[PDB]
Design a protein around this ligand. Structure first.
Ligand code: CU
Length: 124
């Protein structure tokens, strides 16, 4: 199945957001990151993807379809707006084995609050 994630200048959780900011998918599902507003992209965050998973980084304003395979939690960011809090989490499967590594990684304040909220929204 395919899921859109919208790259937004603002949304219900405020300024510079992925919507949804948390999403649980199955292996083989796709997430299509939509450049709903101009100036955004998507990139995996250092240290925040499962063992054996490929990192990825899209171009700004690119409609970017990612296939997820390896189970676990994936921290994602918008490259230009990471420091301003533009982040999300995609979780593949239940009971993510890399949860503590993901929770432990240091991020700027705004980003960390939204990562933590997304992990909590996913039941972790
Ligand atoms: Cu952005």
């Amino acid at each position: 199945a395919d899921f859109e994630v919208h790259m937004l200048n603002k949304g219900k959780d405020g300024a510079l957001v992925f919507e949804p900011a948390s999403l649980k998918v199955a292996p083989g599902d796709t997430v299509t990151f939509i450049p709903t507003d101009k100036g955004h992209n998507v990139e995996t965050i250092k240290g925040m993807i499962p063992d054996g998973a490929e990192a990825f980084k899209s171009k700004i304003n690119e409609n970017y379809k990612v296939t997820f395979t390896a189970p676990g939690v994936y921290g994602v960011k918008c490259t230009p707006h990471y420091g301003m809090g533009m982040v999300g989490v995609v979780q593949v499967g239940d009971a993510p084995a890399n949860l503590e590594a993901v929770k432990g990684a240091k991020n700027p304040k705004k980003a960390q609050e939204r990562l933590d909220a997304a992990l909590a929204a996913l039941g972790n």
